[PDB]
Ligand binder design. Structure first.
Ligand SMILES: *[C@@H]1O[C@H](CO[C@@H]2O[C@@H](C)[C@@H](O)[C@@H](O)[C@@H]2O)[C@@H](O[C@@H]2O[C@H](CO)[C@@H](O)[C@H](O)[C@H]2NC(C)=O)[C@H](O)[C@H]1NC(C)=O
Ligand SMILES: *[C@@H]1O[C@H](CO)[C@@H](O)[C@H](O)[C@H]1NC(C)=O
Lengths: 99, 8, 274
């Protein structure tokens, strides 16, 4: 049972430059459990990332959340880099504020 | 509270 | 409405890297409230929800001790399974368990359960009657026989009908302001171009609680359920949830599609257009 993780990046509130918000990276449907998750700001690792909401669905695949507080800027870019055995190299998914 | 497990 | 107390337990071996990593995460409904991670410096059961501050220091000591004992139990389970399945000790393996109970609005037991998985596949599960187990294979059958002779079903049933129900009632009481609340979803629609001369319409639902919700797209008053795309409801970092559902429609025909949002916090379902 080896399933590649789905990686979703989103903010708590619709983004507004200059206003405090929360950025989320939800990694789901993966197996085995071992995995590395990093949130980035302009290509650099964000230090105070909180890991939470760890669980698994009925098919036993794992789910986990990484989130941090942030204040969106027009040009700062954010992303979530994930490393899982189902992949040869780390996968970096960006925050798409227009989604 | 959590349950106290014993080996399989 | 109904409420639940659930524990997700994971034990993962890692040959050559030391002892297995052991984790326990507890939830009251869709809200995380306790956690244990053997990979912490000083492993201890810790609060994950504000209202758990109401439990005294003895609660934490008690649960911490229980967790350390469970960790050992699962470490032995991992080793035992290598024997049942006749597998090499050099590979990593995983044991998973969901354990919990659910009560009705009146605080009365509705159902109890506890199921195991080994490397992502059903291993053993307690039957609805809370009296017997059902094994997925011959390895689990051995476990079933051991547990039966040890009277484990009776011990587990007592926990599910007593301890589990009683603590869930207490948790709901202490954190009532958090667990019994209702946050109404705020919705909006985004629009995106497509090469094929049509557009993608995406309906967003934000800041809601509890997690259960329904998002649909309608045309001519009928649900397009089939041809739409969506993500599973997901946590947003502050105790609330969010979700989105999209549909691909013909350019110029956007106004003919409407998004419907049904939620406990929506007296009347929301209807949005682009
Ligand atoms: C949540 O319940 C409290 C009832 O007491 C609680 O008991 C503790 C175990 C813990 O859960 C704390 O929140 C409270 O101490 C409600 O507080 C009472 O509310 C009544 C109105 O029903 C009011 O007359 C009393 O003065 C309050 N009593 C105390 C001791 O504060 C609280 O209002 C509930 N909150 C929600 C959102 O339902
Ligand atoms: C266990 O597997 C090994 C191969 O790795 C094999 O030699 C041995 O016979 C197996 N034992 C049983 C009881 O199947």
């Amino acid at each position: 049972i080896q399933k590649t993780p789905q990686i979703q990046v989103y903010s708590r509130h619709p983004p507004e430059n200059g206003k405090p918000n929360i950025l989320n990276c939800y990694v789901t449907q993966f197996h085995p459990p071992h995995i590395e998750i990093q949130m980035l700001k302009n290509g650099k690792k964000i230090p105070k990332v909180e890991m939470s909401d760890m669980s698994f669905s009925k098919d036993w695949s794992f789910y986990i959340l990484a989130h941090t507080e942030f204040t969106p800027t027009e040009t700062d870019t954010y992303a979530c880099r994930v490393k899982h055995d189902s992949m040869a190299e780390p996968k970096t998914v960006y925050w798409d504020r227009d989604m | 509270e959590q349950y106290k497990f014993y080996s399989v | 409405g109904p409420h639940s107390l659930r524990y997700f337990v994971t034990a993962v071996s890692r040959p050559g890297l030391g002892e297995p990593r052991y984790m326990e995460v507890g939830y009251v409904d869709d809200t995380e409230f306790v956690r244990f991670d053997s990979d912490a410096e000083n492993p201890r059961y810790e609060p994950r929800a504000r209202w758990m501050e109401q439990e005294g220091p003895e609660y934490w000591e008690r649960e911490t001790q229980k967790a350390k004992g469970n960790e050992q139990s699962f470490r032995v389970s991992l080793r035992t399974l290598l024997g049942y399945y006749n597998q090499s000790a050099g590979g990593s393996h995983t044991i998973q368990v969901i354990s919990g109970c659910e009560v009705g609005s009146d605080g009365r037991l509705l159902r109890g359960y506890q199921q195991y998985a080994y490397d992502g596949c059903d291993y053993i599960a307690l039957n609805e009657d809370l009296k017997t187990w059902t094994a997925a294979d011959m390895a689990a059958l051995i476990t079933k026989h051991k547990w039966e002779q040890a009277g484990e079903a009776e011990r587990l049933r007592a926990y599910l009908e007593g301890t589990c129900v009683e603590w869930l009632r207490r948790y709901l009481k202490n954190g009532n302001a958090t667990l019994l609340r209702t946050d109404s979803p705020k919705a909006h629609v985004t629009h995106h171009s497509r090469p094929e001369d049509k557009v993608t319409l995406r309906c967003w639902a934000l800041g809601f609680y509890p997690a259960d919700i329904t998002l649909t797209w309608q045309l001519n008053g009928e649900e397009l359920i089939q041809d739409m795309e969506l993500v599973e409801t997901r946590p947003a970092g502050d105790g609330t949830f969010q979700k989105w559902a999209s549909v691909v429609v013909p350019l110029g025909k956007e106004q003919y599609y409407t998004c419907h949002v049904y939620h406990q916090g929506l007296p009347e379902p929301l209807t949005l257009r682009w």
